[PDB]
Amino acid sequence: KLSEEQQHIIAILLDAHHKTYDPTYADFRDFRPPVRMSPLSMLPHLADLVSYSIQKVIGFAKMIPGFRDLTSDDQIVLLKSSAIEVIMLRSNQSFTMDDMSWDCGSQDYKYDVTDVSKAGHTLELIEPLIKFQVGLKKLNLHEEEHVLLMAICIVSPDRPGVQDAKLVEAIQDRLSNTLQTYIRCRHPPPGSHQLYAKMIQKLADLRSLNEEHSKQYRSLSFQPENSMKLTPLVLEVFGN
């Protein structure tokens, strides 16, 4: 049932993820240092982390089958709308339920809810974000399902500003059908039970997390003292 082209799609996405996700986290040494001390002491470090991840998300998106068939405008709007969501998805690889933290190789680069608070965010975002990470971790996705979900997240036709919604739909449908068939043929029960529906539910969760993050980002970025600590890429992609 899993066609040769569907296996090809999965192979491309696995390779794309391997070329854009560094599990050694070596580049974190280039970021402005984390500081745990009212002041948004983790904002510089986490802004560099997010900016770095945006670059990785773009590199992954460019390798999604069909993505470069879109216009420059549509590629841009899809990445602007999806970047925060793909960051939340891909960060799940470092997330551990042992202590509900994003463990990136060392104590300095191990992040918890208090670190996100020290970048300016509130429980309105942080609690649903932790529950998302826990719920996504509990799915115990195969790597194949993880990279397919990230690709589907990016190529969604209902994003604000999409021009050629039908072409975006055709690209996503190819990935969605690849994912649905992968689960049917490669994911053994009981883990496969309603797995596609649960994964699409996580995409809905991400839209809500996206909305709340943008709300808080807009309020944080509205203060020039905070925007001064962001990066040029973050300002371009996230806003202002």
Partner: peptide
């Protein structure tokens, strides 16, 4: 607006 950094990363 204009997105020169995203455009550049998209090649």
């Amino acid at each position: 607006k204009n997105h020169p950094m995203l455009m550049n990363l998209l090649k």
